Motif scaffolding. Structure first.
Motif, short mmCIF file in Angstrom:
data_model
loop_
_atom_site.label_atom_id
_atom_site.label_comp_id
_atom_site.label_asym_id
_atom_site.label_seq_id
_atom_site.Cartn_x
_atom_site.Cartn_y
_atom_site.Cartn_z
N UNK A 26 0.80 -1.21 0.00
CA UNK A 26 0.00 0.00 0.00
C UNK A 26 0.85 1.28 0.00
N UNK A 27 2.10 1.17 0.43
CA UNK A 27 2.98 2.33 0.51
C UNK A 27 3.39 2.81 -0.86
N UNK A 28 3.25 1.95 -1.87
CA UNK A 28 3.67 2.26 -3.24
C UNK A 28 2.67 3.07 -4.07
N UNK A 29 1.40 3.06 -3.67
CA UNK A 29 0.33 3.61 -4.50
C UNK A 29 0.59 5.09 -4.83
N UNK A 30 0.73 5.92 -3.81
CA UNK A 30 0.92 7.34 -4.04
C UNK A 30 2.24 7.69 -4.70
N UNK A 31 3.37 7.18 -4.17
CA UNK A 31 4.64 7.49 -4.81
C UNK A 31 4.71 7.07 -6.28
N UNK A 32 4.20 5.88 -6.62
CA UNK A 32 4.20 5.47 -8.03
C UNK A 32 3.30 6.37 -8.87
N UNK A 33 2.15 6.73 -8.31
CA UNK A 33 1.25 7.64 -8.96
C UNK A 33 1.93 8.99 -9.23
N UNK A 34 2.69 9.48 -8.26
CA UNK A 34 3.49 10.70 -8.41
C UNK A 34 4.58 10.52 -9.45
#
Ligand SMILES: [Mg+2]
Ligand SMILES: [Zn+2]
Length: 216
Positions: A26-34
Motif C-alpha cells: 500500500x505504501x507504493x500507490x501514491x509514490x508510483x502515482x506521483x
C-alpha cells in the motif's frame, strides 16, 4: 527514449483485502502515482501490466489435488515434444480476470483511464506461469510489450511495482536480455517475502544481468 513499466499494481497484491497481499504494498500507490506524473522524469511512455488469470490457471493450488497454496510444483513445458520442466510455487487464487482482485488499484487505474496508458496483460494462458511482462517462463508466448517499446523508440526501461522477487525481477531481466538499458527503482518496489534478506538477493541478481538498481 525512456519508458516506465509499472508492474502488477493490482488489488490482490496491494490491498490487505487482496488474496495475495505484498507486505507494505500500500505504501507504493501514491509514490508510483506521483512518479507517473512527474515531468522531470522525462517518461516518453508509461506501460502498466496486469496478471490476468483464468480461474482454472495451473499456478493456483486450488487446481491441484492434494496440493495447498505456497507448495512447490514441477511445471512442464507446454510445447509438444519438449519435456523440460521448471520448479515453481503454487499460489492462492489471485488476479482472476474481471474480478476486483485483478483491477489496477484505483489511483493507478484512474491515471490509466484518463491518460489512455498502454496495458499489457500476462498470465491468461491456463497452462503456464508468466512472471515476466515480456513473455512466459518458457519464452514461448510473447506479449506485445517489446513491439510497443520499439514503436515508441525506447532505449531505456525503468521498472517499478510488485512483487520485487517475481514479476519485477522477471520483467527487468527480459528487458535487459532484449537490449534495453534497464533500471529498477528499488524504493518503488516491494517483495512479497517479509524477509529483508530477499531485497539484497534480488539486488545482486539484477546487477549480474547488468540492470541498474537505484533507490529513487
Ligand atoms: Mg491479504
Ligand atoms: Zn500470478
Amino acid at each position: 527514449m525512456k519508458t516506465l513499466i509499472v508492474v502488477d499494481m493490482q488489488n490482490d497484491f496491494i490491498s490487505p483485502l487482496g488474496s495475495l497481499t505484498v507486505p507494505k504494498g500500500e505504501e507504493l500507490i501514491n509514490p508510483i502515482s506521483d512518479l507517473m506524473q512527474d515531468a522531470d522524469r522525462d517518461w516518453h511512455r508509461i506501460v502498466v501490466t496486469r496478471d490476468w488469470h483464468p480461474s482454472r490457471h495451473i499456478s493456483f493450488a486450488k487446481n491441484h489435488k492434494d496440493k495447498e497454496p505456497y507448495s512447490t510444483y514441477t511445471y512442464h513445458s507446454p510445447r509438444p515434444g519438449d519435456d523440460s520442466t521448471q520448479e515453481g510455487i503454487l499460489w492462492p487464487v489471485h488476479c482472476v480476470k474481471n474480478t476486483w482482485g485483478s483491477q489496477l488499484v484505483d489511483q493507478i487505474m484512474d491515471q490509466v483511464v484518463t491518460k489512455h496508458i498502454k496495458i499489457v496483460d500476462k498470465g491468461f494462458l491456463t497452462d503456464r506461469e508468466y512472471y515476466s511482462a515480456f513473455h512466459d517462463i518458457w519464452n514461448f508466448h510473447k506479449t506485445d510489450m517489446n513491439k510497443y517499446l520499439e514503436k515508441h523508440h525506447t532505449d531505456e526501461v525503468y521498472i517499478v511495482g510488485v512483487a520485487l522477487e517475481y514479476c519485477v525481477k522477471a520483467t527487468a531481466i527480459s528487458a535487459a536480455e532484449l537490449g534495453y538499458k534497464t533500471t529498477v527503482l528499488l524504493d518503488y518496489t516491494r517483495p512479497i517475502s517479509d524477509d529483508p534478506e530477499v531485497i539484497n538477493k534480488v539486488k545482486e541478481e539484477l546487477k549480474a544481468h547488468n540492470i541498474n538498481v537505484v533507490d529513487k
